[PDB]
Design a binder for this molecule. Sequence first.
Ligand code: CA
Ligand code: CA
Ligand code: CA
Ligand code: CA
Ligand code: CA
Ligand code: CA
Ligand code: CA
Ligand code: CA
Lengths: 659, 659
Amino acid sequence: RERTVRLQYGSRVEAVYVLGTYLWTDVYSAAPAGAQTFSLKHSEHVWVEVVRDGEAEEVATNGKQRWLLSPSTTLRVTMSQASTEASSDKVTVNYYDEEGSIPIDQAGLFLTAIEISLDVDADRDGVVEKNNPKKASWTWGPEGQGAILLVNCDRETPWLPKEDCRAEKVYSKEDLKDMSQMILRTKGPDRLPAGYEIVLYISMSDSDKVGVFYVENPFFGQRYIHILGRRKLYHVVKYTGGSAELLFFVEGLCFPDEGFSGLVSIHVSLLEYMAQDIPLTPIFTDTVIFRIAPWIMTPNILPPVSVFVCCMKDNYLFLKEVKNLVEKTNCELKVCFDRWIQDEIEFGYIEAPHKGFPVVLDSPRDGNLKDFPVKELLGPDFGYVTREPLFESVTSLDSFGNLEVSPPVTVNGKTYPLGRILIGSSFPLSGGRRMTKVVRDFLKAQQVQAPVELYSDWLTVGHVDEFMSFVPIPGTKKFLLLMASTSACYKLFREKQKDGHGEAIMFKGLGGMSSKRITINKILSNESLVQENLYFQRCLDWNRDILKKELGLTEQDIIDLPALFKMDEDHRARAFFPNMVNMIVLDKDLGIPKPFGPQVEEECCLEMHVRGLLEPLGLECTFIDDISAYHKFLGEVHCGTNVRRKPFTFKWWHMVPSR
Amino acid sequence: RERTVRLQYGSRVEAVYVLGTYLWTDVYSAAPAGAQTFSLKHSEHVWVEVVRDGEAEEVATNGKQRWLLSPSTTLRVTMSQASTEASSDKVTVNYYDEEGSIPIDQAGLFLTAIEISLDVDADRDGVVEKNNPKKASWTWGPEGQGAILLVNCDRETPWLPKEDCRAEKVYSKEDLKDMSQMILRTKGPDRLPAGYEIVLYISMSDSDKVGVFYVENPFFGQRYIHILGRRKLYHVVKYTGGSAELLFFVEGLCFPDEGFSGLVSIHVSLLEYMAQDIPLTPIFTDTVIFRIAPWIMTPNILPPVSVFVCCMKDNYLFLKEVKNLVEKTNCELKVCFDRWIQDEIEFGYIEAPHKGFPVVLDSPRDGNLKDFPVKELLGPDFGYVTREPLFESVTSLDSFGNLEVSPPVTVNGKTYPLGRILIGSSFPLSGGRRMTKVVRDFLKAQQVQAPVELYSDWLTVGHVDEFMSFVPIPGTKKFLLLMASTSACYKLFREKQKDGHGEAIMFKGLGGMSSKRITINKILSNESLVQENLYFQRCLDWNRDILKKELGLTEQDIIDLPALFKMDEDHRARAFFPNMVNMIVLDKDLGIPKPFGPQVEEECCLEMHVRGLLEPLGLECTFIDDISAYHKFLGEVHCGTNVRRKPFTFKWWHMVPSR
Ligand SMILES: [Ca+2]
Ligand SMILES: [Ca+2]
Ligand SMILES: [Ca+2]
Ligand SMILES: [Ca+2]
Ligand SMILES: [Ca+2]
Ligand SMILES: [Ca+2]
Ligand SMILES: [Ca+2]
Ligand SMILES: [Ca+2]
């Protein structure tokens, strides 16, 4: 950086020189009238070049050498080390008229060199390197750089109930591990020259995105001074001489969102005082950039950690069968004593090079079924985030049964290493339901999961989790998409009827269904029901095509599971028997809703068919009965499970998202 | 594109096949119970493959060949040409049980193949190519593609006073040349099969960004039907058989801005009717993208076309000297009978491959000096755009004396082929004036001029045009930055004093200045005035450094012109004599404000000094006296000029802007 510092007519100018810059110095404007030539002297630690029309020549500390005064002949002044002061650092210029060799005047420059660098971990190893030249920008990819910041959305202690980022005060030390370090490094003499001060600052816009603290170590214990953030745009820094470092901790307050890219800036400036009523001049400015880490979801293929379950305390079969399934795995089971864990919560995570933790997204309140957020999962290294609409009404499509994510896929050459978020919607011209804009905008803004809308609005409840899921193929790195299929169910029932099983009864053991006496015959002879399910198969097939296109899937990647629906008064589908596709996936072990299908030789023909599809792949199937405690099935699921998974090993900052 | 079309149990399914796709067909779900094998027949124009577990085999129009029924054995159905109908296009599947060779059932697929393509000029040559595969995205650069749209911001006829884009009706044909062509091309039989329709549509969000018209040629003359736009989100298209083209014209209503990237989408879908109360299914969708052309400014280096001048009718010297200067060039002079042409107007332009026109940006009204926009320049191929603040007060920094643009520059390897917009501001921590956000946001959103803020708030008026300008170097492709310099003025005056000229009088011939009797001596002996101008030189030097950094300039690229200011009660600068830097640049010819400096041998020493700087470069200087009609100079300029220039030859869409 070239900085302009010109000599002043018959005067000695004092300036602070910041290392990493250099000065160009006009000696011509300061020459007395009549002056012809000049000479110069300079101290040991100052490098001085005489530059005439672009060509430079170094000059000795004291030469008697004289040059022609001229506007195009200037000085270039460089220093490579900070002033000890001690430290006479100066350049002095003498002026001579035509006749006689004694100087007729003098102008001088007295310099104090200091180092000022605001440093962050831009190279993303968890340590703050000295003056990364790339610290002022942020680039994606394995070769990309720039510092990363977590939203500090967890809670260190229950005493103050809100997320840590909702306070301008730090009430606990462990909080510091969630933040990103920023160090102001300076080197110089005992004091700054008269008229200077160093100031940290942020823009008004960024002031609600971040907060910045300094940890003071005064007499009575460590304390955290909040120096930038909400309603603090600048902080005057106390200068310390010699080599000094000031450590700051930065917290994010906000996830990327509509109107906020995720990028924020912090600045330090050396300011020079001019006079009263005149603003201070920013002599030098150094900038660092942070990108706030996005909220990221976990597909079913990722290793399970915890299985969260909610049910009534008397659903014994459900609890026993889930407990047993989990015991086949290394997962922990957590139970709460009714679908809220599935519908109201999506477990995601955030990560930065220095740390990461899981973060819950909380579905919006409708003012009917949900009047209150679920914050009870908020805790140490378990974060919380939510979005609520302003004018928009919430519908069933805002439930997180309607929010899922694919395994990593490659589509037309483009890799999506974190998978793609999937949410259900209605056709553009339909006037149907859609997830609220506020939530859709939030998911889109995270960018690294590139969301895709599917068609869920043909279902009464309207959730993608009703019709599709993903499972790993054991012993490989591959996965399958599972799709509900009504055509598969009809084909199976028709075969069983042909086989002499037409009188086989659905719903065995649900006493509340017995008087209906539903048989394969009864189902197959219902003409309107056939027509309803042909239509529902068209709806499923429309989704199949979107999934194949947007996930880069072929028919080889898909298995169809038998399903059946009944149309409601809105021309929307509700499950006729439990939807087996919505299943608990713990690696090779699958908890599958028990269908209560027609019994043939005392086994459910739906269970046997599903085992015949999945078991050859090495998938182990356990059928879980959540409904027999209720004595009947109306199309509604009363129990819920949500699996918290390990994050992807692929770092999100190694992705390169579309512009 | 693979599309799912499955056979229906014991039924003949009718489907429209859109060319460019192909179908995968399940024959297994439609097989009767007990069926073992199947055979198939197909017509001439249908290609059918039997696919077992991913391996495909083509099958003859009628073979007697039988395959094992199985879920993993399916059909793949392809058509390469549209149905004439005429046209029996079908695939028929026969089912057989174990014992006996006569078919026990049949399922069939009756197909009507059509071509549907929505086409735009994506390759940017001005003609609409057939089905550019890149038409659904927009990329920058010489190899980039996607279609470009102009904001139709001019006015075809004065009858309806507003810009054309502010009406949902087309009142003149010439308007069509401003728009972009979009053609829906279809090929098929005489009619679509029962239950289908073709619909064009746009999103609600995009509905205020565009409008789309069809030109009907009915009995009484051509007319323009507005089929998409404000409060029209969709249009049902009338299908024509054979090969048909429907021509549409698209207009932009909005420039890129805060919250609007400039990109918009138009869709066509083939919809299938299901039943009453059930939304129509989008069987096929084709999408085109338009990017709306940005508003672009012109630096002083570009060829001049028209010089616009405003003054009082009695300023004779000004008019005579401007007229004469322009006569040295090929420019036209336009005069209006007071700085509004300079302050209230910035001439820009827009361009698309099919056409471009100049466009005026109109400075915001303050409710004091400007209560009304200047729309009188609005006309055929002269466009208009404006931005007004909502809650923000307008200040002097919103005048377009404060809005300029650099010549093309390269900075740290990055080329800015259109130059960089320059606007004056105040320091971040100063609490000073700044251009309104609404205007700043607009300029930033155009993206191709990557704006830079300079420091203008040390000036009373506060405009970058007060202290800096650019001139070409004649006979070369290079340019210089000119900077006001107070140090240069003092050096010159000190030399003249030494030379015996101290009693030389400023402002000769302005009788309203005579009693002040201002001389070189009087100026040089004023101590406080020296201090004021030393400070003003620091302000100029701060800008010099920003310009060098952000424009990639060295000292070799800069010439300093003498200037002098007087500090006001706000500690801000007003010109002591006319600022010579704010000059009319017509290629090698420069109209320079006449300074009225001290006379030495009956020539102004400021004029002679400026000629000595510029003339060796081949620049011709004409000094223009706008003030003698007023008899005095108070620091205010009463006349204004604005030069309308030819656009850059470099196409804006060939740039690659930062992410
Ligand atoms: Ca590091
Ligand atoms: Ca915390
Ligand atoms: Ca923590
Ligand atoms: Ca979910
Ligand atoms: Ca073309
Ligand atoms: Ca027009
Ligand atoms: Ca026009
Ligand atoms: Ca201007």
